[PDB]
Amino acid sequence: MFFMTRHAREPRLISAYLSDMVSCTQPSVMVSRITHTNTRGRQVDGVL
């Protein structure tokens, strides 16, 4: 029910929850010409 409240002490269960959440949705199928990038060149995947 409440991650950040109950498991407010252990900082690894929260990261596990976040990883499971981001790796839960099917990636959309859209290749585009100009998208978001970072300084090095990696493209951004999602928004939180």
């Binding site: 199928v29 859209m30 290749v31 585009s32 010409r33 100009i34």
Partner: peptide, 27 residues
């Protein structure tokens, strides 16, 4: 500017599982 990728194909001998068996063709 924005397209859709269709038919993500896949081969077998590039997978990696093709090191437990010796596959070979025969007519």
């Amino acid at each position: 500017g924005t397209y859709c990728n269709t038919l993500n194909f896949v081969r077998f001998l590039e997978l990696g599982l093709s090191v437990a068996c010796i596959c070979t063709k025969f007519p």
